[PDB]
Amino acid sequence: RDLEASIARYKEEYAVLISEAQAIKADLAAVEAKVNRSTALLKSLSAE
């Protein structure tokens, strides 16, 4: 029973970690779009 409890506890931590990872992934995605846009803007500026 104790072991089971421990496992359960671990699971929550794991879940939290996963959530964090997803958040980070989202952030990364957001950044990438900006970079894509930003590069284009830079190019435009150069042209001008």
């Binding site: 072991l3 089971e4 421990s6 496992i7 671990y10």
Partner: peptide
């Protein structure tokens, strides 16, 4: 997983 295995054993 390890914990689960242990539980199974015991």
């Amino acid at each position: 997983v390890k914990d689960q295995q242990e539980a199974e054993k015991k």
